[PDB]
Symmetry: D2
Subunit: 198 residues, 4 copies
Amino acid sequence: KHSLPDLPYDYGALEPHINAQIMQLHHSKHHAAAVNNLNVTEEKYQEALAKGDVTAQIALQPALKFNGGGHINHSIFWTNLSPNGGGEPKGELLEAIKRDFGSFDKFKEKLTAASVGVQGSGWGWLGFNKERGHLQIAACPNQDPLQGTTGLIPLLGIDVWEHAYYLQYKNVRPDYLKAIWNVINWENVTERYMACKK
Amino acid sequence: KHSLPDLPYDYGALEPHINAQIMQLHHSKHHAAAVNNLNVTEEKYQEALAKGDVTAQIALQPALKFNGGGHINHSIFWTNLSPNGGGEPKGELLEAIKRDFGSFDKFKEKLTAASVGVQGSGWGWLGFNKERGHLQIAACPNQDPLQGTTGLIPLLGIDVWEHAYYLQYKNVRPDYLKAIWNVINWENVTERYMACKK
Amino acid sequence: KHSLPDLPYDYGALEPHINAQIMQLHHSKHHAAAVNNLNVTEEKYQEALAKGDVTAQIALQPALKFNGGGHINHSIFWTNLSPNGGGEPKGELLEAIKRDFGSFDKFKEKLTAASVGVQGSGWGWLGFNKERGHLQIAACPNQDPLQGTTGLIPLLGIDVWEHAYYLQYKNVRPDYLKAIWNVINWENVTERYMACKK
Amino acid sequence: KHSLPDLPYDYGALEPHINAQIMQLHHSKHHAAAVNNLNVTEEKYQEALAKGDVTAQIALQPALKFNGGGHINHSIFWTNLSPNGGGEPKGELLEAIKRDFGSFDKFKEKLTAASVGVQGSGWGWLGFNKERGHLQIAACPNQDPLQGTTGLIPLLGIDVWEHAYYLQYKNVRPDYLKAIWNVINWENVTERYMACKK
Ligand SMILES: [Mn+2]
Ligand SMILES: [Mn+2]
Ligand SMILES: [Mn+2]
Ligand SMILES: [Mn+2]
């Protein structure tokens, strides 16, 4: 049974970049609903599968991807942020960034471009392509999860759904992006990056 | 050259169902940006077309549909609302509603279901199917316009993008839907409906 | 554990409308492959679900919809055809056709249009809308099944993937569509329709 | 005003890898039809744009992408093949292949996999990423063109729509893929690649 993970920090630990109201609603309501909805959908799929009901299985895909993706994306997102985040990585991750995007600053501009470029709801991602053995930026619509839909391993995700910033920044997503860089938990992004080595 | 249409009423004319802050941002920022962006995209398409650059034409489709759809959807949305709206239609529109959905109340439940059911950004619509000669409910993702993508003629649209309600109702879209019924401008929906007769 | 259903007739029974070579390849290769692939994908989804691996479940969705839909669609298709078929349906089904589409010929033109209009691979369908209690025509891309993706109950399906007609009709899909009316098993379509009333 | 390009060789010049019947139908029917359809759709878009009819412009998008992409993709495809082709590329292109994919054989396996993996109609492509300055393999659905929908520059394309191989290879697409390597015009792929450096 899937469960809602506790936030790694208090709801106001990211102020003033992302206000506590946002953090509380985003976690206790948005992520919470996805988890309960996911459990309900998985239950239905096990029944449809046991009866070999392919039509039911197909009809349940949108709900499974949306609530499942919602759980996957937010679980990673929380760890991607930290009160002591910000600045830039150091070591292998940093070297990969410069290698694949030219410079950290260039990388920031590219991931920002992908995030701001999302038309409708979605996420901007910095991922790792195991096949190519390099970093790659990608954008996903709605709650479609990065690995489940592209195969790329998620390192850093930026939620550009309006509920992730509208209460504080309104229609100006670029202001939201500019601010979030101040809280990126590079220690966690680095750990996720190294996990792809082994 | 496309232009931003004036709101048929003041920004606070729909209180308390949709607060004035929402109305001002939604109109002066969201709809406004779409119009200017549309004009810019149309300019680019005329050039690509003149040079017979099919690749450019294809690359510009997402922007044309999104900003074009944005202009189309919001232009209709404003007229779909009114300070003196609410209640239910009377005459042919009402008879069609009962005929195709059983009862006005049933119709309200169905269009609400379609609107609340949107995963991600989108719109709920009550449209007219000229081919079948009857009413039909449909949901569209992001800014995809109803007639341009489904052929159905738009009668009543419900914006379920989070920017349309988050500041007032937060994550609870159902509360937003319940409230919007109080401001539906049935006079305009009826006019749009009759225009399909001729 | 899904199995390939025996065809209701001999591979050359639909001659000369759909030749024996196509019938044999379509059943023994295309449909058979979807069946084998479906059993494999379902087994993997069983493992994913039991492990609570949401990423794997999501990654399996395209294969499940593609191969499962393949099994669903062709199973119905075989029963929708007959060597002693053709002509027109009678009783209630025919009444509905005239009611919902105007006449039998208008219905044919509409289903043909939807079928010839498919860009890429897909299917044309005559389905029943349980919510609206009336007939409805629809087109589905690739192997996306009617009920699983639209909620509509399938009554008559027309496979417009190129393997359904190329060997005999080459690029002229309209010729295939004209010929298939000669083998439509209205007895079966009627059963599916009446099974909707109950 | 777009025109159908003459084939660079005789219809039976690619025998026995791709037979003459397929080559003739593919060029004179499939590609020719896309050209005619494209000119028609572009003319309608010219009228829509001049009128400021955003709904019509949006409604024309599927036809424009489908027929325009058809023109783009096949035009490149013809030049990607040759009767005296086959073997392997040399110089820089070959260097990049080993660099980006490991070896020529690994590249072949990867392009083949992407091509055989297309569910429904589509294309497998070897393209150049100008942003990352490296080779990249990608698959496109139906006639969606590489550059117009992915920004990648097309170097080598493989049509996996069933009309590209069914008459000769029937359902065994892998056999088609194996055979096509014998007629790849590496001279042309090289030109497209070098044209990316400048
Ligand atoms: Mn979120
Ligand atoms: Mn809006
Ligand atoms: Mn088939
Ligand atoms: Mn082709």
